């Protein structure tokens, strides 16, 4: 078929929020989002898997996790999970600070995507598009801490976590590889996927 741009992907198949903050994040580190296409794309892919892994876990009053799956959360309900990904350097920076400087938790040295409130642990999210073993290893070579917990999904269903632990409910990740499958099925029919799965490096 006819060969697709990835701009006209991104912005058809993305919330506008998502791409906004992926518009900005590239901006800021000197990246223009109309050059480095494949990455634009895959920044907007891990930051929507970050919102996806922490939608609709809360906190409840007697302070255990639980999933409220519609937009109706109770009052006294807190988000599980602070997200780091998306913000500004400061601003990231800001909310790393707090929340080391409160719970104790020692100050990573790279920003990770998120924070657990259940498990009083950094997440470090990770797509890829080569194996999850392989990515896995490259993600730890930057954290000599093994306070931040790691999990690497890839766009064929396969994960991997720090010690098998996953975190999460099998169907809250089942939303998220669902949601990849049908990011790569897309650029399948727009001839997109061959060069956006080729681009990654490491
Ligand atoms: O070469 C590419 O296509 C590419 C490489 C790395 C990332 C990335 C990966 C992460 O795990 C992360 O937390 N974050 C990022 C990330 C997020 C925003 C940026 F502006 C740059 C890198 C995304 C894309
Ligand atoms: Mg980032
Ligand atoms: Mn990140
Ligand atoms: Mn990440």
Sequence with gaps: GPLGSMEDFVRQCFNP?????????????????????????????????????????????????????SGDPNALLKHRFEIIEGRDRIMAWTVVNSICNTTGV??????????????????????????????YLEKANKIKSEKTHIHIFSFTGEEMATKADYTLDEESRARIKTRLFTIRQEMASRSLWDSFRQSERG
Excluded at 35 to 58: G, P, R, W
Excluded at 113 to 118: E, G, R, V
């Design 17 to 69: 929020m998502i791409v906004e903050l992926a518009e900005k994040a590239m901006k800021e580190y000197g990246e223009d989002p109309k050059i480095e296409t494949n990455k634009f794309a895959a920044i907007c892919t891990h930051l929507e898997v970050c919102f996806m892994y922490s939608d609709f876990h809360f906190i409840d009053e007697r302070g255990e996790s639980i999933i409220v799956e």
């Design 106 to 135: 020692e100050k990573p040295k790279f920003l990770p995507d998120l924070y657990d409130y259940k498990e009083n642990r950094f997440i470090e999210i990770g797509v890829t598009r080569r194996e999850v073993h392989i990515y």
